[PDB]
Amino acid sequence: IQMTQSPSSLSASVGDRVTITCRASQDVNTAVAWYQQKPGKAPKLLIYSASFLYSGVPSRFSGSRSGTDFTLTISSLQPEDFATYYCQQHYTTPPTFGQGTKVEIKRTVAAPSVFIFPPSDEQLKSGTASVVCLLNNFYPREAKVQWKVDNALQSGASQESVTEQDSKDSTYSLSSTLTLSKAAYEKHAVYACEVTHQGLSSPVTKSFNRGE
Amino acid sequence: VQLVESGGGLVQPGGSLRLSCAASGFNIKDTYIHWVRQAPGKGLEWVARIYPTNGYTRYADSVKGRFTISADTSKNTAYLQMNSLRAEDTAVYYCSRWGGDGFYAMDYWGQGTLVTVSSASTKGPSVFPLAPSTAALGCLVKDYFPEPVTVSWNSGALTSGVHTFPAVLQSSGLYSLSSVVTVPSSSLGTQTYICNVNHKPSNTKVDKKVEP
């Protein structure tokens, strides 16, 4: 028995009413549970037997059933409900989970603060050079970070990482790391990261001249 | 009620590894005990279950034959013996129970334990400063294996404004991350900033002062 969960992700604001649905591939009676999982932690039971609020779960969570369709409702979305939610059937063995629903908090647009870091002298000693561009406290999550070495656009020498949504201000932060050999790093002069984001009227560039 | 796991870590491909799930505050004789796993960045997958009173077991097809779930009622502990381990088995492993003979679904979960199946050796990180010049500063935590590392600032006295990014796997097979923080510009050169990097799998401890 499969569990088709929708949507895969959603964005809603604090206080919004949120609906997550899950369709069982066949009858599963009411043998259905809903779980919440926060980054870095074990899943946590919210609803059991389709509609029963689990002890200690806030009353804004509820579940209901209509045939093969099951629905989790959060009446008033809170900042602390940033998580992935999972539906699960245990009508037959093996029990199966839905594929999850990423819930993020909607907030106003916030432009990133941008910083660029040259490679440390210690790292250059070992023969590698990492250049790090930081985008701090922005929303939405989507952003475009391009590396330019001597005003030439780079391809496939950088990796990105994004933090989870911040608990207070609901923003994201992002790092982009350009990795080069020491020899290649010493052959160029200007290192720049160029940032395009909804919160910026025009792209922001931070740069440095190697050695200066 | 508590479920406390132990036994994970880094294991060679084709190797063996045994996890334990110790229960407190209830009798495992009364319930089913489950193992559930979560590969990095993926959802939840059921692994196996046991009814300890009679030792009856069920397994997922992907682990049938290779894994053995077992239990010792006099130790109130269940076990997962993993054999012929594959890279596909790398995951956080959770243990759980059918609360209320299933009616309550999986109401209690262990904290999870990370199992990494890889032939790569352990390696501690090099920690390089992300020097400043509101300011941002940080530490590049480069080239370690396996996960995880933890980062703190000034031994936990600096917490607000910190972003420790999720590790990314580099093309070399080693992990890398940065941790950054925003501080007052007026504090540089007199206030002292040290990142505390801990990599328990390699028994590596590094405190790195970041100066402008």
Side-chain angles (χ1 to χ4, degrees):
Chain A
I1 299 176
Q2 197 114 354
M3 299 299 271
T4 301
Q5 188 168 343
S6 55
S8 280
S9 60
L10 72 94
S11 302
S13 297
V14 165
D16 280 16
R17 190 170 186 102
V18 165
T19 296
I20 302 172
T21 62
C22 182
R23 181 167 284 168
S25 69
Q26 76 184 75
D27 169 54
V28 293
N29 203 272
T30 59
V32 157
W34 288 94
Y35 300 89
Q36 181 193 70
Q37 189 176 34
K38 286 175 187 213
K41 295 169 67 187
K44 171 187 191 223
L45 176 69
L46 304 163
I47 302 289
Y48 59 94
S49 188
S51 55
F52 294 82
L53 187 62
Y54 188 61
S55 337
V57 179
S59 60
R60 59 174 182 274
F61 292 91
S62 69
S64 77
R65 173 221 181 176
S66 182
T68 42
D69 283 329
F70 298 79
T71 297
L72 180 70
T73 303
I74 311 170
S75 65
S76 182
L77 188 68
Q78 294 305 304
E80 54 269 21
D81 302 345
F82 172 84
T84 297
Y85 293 80
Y86 291 101
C87 57
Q88 177 207 54
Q89 70 81 28
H90 54 90
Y91 189 58
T92 52
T93 309
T96 48
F97 297 85
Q99 288 178 336
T101 297
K102 298 183 178 179
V103 176
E104 75 147 10
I105 309 301
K106 272 231 185 150
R107 67 151 280 161
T108 55
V109 173
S113 305
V114 187
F115 306 84
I116 189 168
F117 297 99
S120 66
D121 283 312
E122 305 88 297
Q123 185 193 15
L124 293 183
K125 267 147 49 189
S126 340
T128 313
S130 302
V131 193
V132 175
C133 183
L134 166 66
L135 281 65
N136 208 44
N137 297 5
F138 62 98
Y139 186 91
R141 191 182 185 281
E142 304 89 284
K144 187 163 160 192
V145 183
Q146 300 198 302
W147 283 100
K148 292 175 187 239
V149 179
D150 291 333
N151 219 34
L153 166 72
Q154 298 306 287
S155 276
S158 62
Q159 310 187 259
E160 296 189 355
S161 181
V162 190
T163 57
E164 299 294 324
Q165 219 172 8
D166 178 82
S167 59
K168 288 181 179 179
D169 65 5
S170 304
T171 64
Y172 297 96
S173 290
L174 180 149
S175 70
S176 180
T177 303
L178 177 73
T179 296
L180 293 92
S181 66
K182 166 176 170 85
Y185 177 73
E186 304 280 32
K187 277 175 178 38
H188 303 272
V190 187
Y191 291 80
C193 65
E194 169 183 274
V195 175
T196 301
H197 185 268
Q198 198 178 321
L200 304 161
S201 311
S202 52
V204 169
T205 303
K206 297 289 176 179
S207 69
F208 67 83
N209 297 326
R210 168 177 57 81
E212 190 174 5
Chain B
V1 171
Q2 271 191 298
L3 290 180
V4 174
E5 310 171 48
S6 50
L10 166 59
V11 54
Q12 287 275 345
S16 288
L17 189 75
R18 174 185 180 265
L19 309 179
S20 296
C21 179
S24 302
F26 80 101
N27 211 306
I28 66 169
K29 155 199 302 173
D30 304 321
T31 86
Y32 287 88
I33 303 295
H34 296 256
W35 291 92
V36 174
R37 69 179 181 188
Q38 185 170 40
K42 313 282 196 168
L44 300 161
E45 179 188 15
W46 176 83
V47 177
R49 98 176 174 196
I50 184 159
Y51 196 56
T53 292
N54 63 9
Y56 282 21
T57 62
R58 301 289 304 269
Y59 298 91
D61 290 338
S62 63
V63 309
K64 173 179 82 179
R66 299 188 297 122
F67 292 11
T68 300
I69 190 179
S70 65
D72 184 339
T73 52
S74 69
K75 300 184 177 52
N76 219 31
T77 300
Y79 314 84
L80 187 62
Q81 178 71 55
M82 301 184 290
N83 301 293
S84 301
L85 281 163
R86 321 167 172 159
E88 293 84 332
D89 296 315
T90 291
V92 176
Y93 283 74
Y94 299 98
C95 67
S96 206
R97 66 163 200 183
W98 275 152
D101 206 63
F103 180 74
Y104 293 104
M106 291 175 183
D107 53 349
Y108 290 93
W109 298 63
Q111 81 283 25
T113 185
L114 172 63
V115 174
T116 305
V117 184
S118 170
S119 71
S121 294
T122 61
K123 183 202 181 283
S126 303
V127 182
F128 304 115
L130 298 167
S133 179
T134 297
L137 59 97
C139 282
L140 170 58
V141 180
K142 194 177 176 30
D143 293 337
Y144 64 92
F145 192 87
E147 286 268 52
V149 306
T150 59
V151 183
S152 58
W153 283 93
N154 297 342
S155 301
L158 176 52
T159 166
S160 77
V162 173
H163 298 298
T164 300
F165 287 95
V168 306
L169 193 58
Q170 299 163 113
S171 69
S172 72
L174 301 170
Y175 289 99
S176 180
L177 66 76
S178 288
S179 179
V180 301
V181 57
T182 49
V183 306
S185 290
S186 56
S187 73
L188 285 53
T190 68
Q191 243 279 21
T192 185
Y193 297 104
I194 300 176
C195 61
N196 324 106
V197 186
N198 216 281
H199 185 240
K200 62 183 171 57
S202 73
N203 193 47
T204 305
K205 194 195 88 76
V206 177
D207 297 314
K208 196 62 172 170
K209 181 170 195 263
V210 188
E211 38 168 301

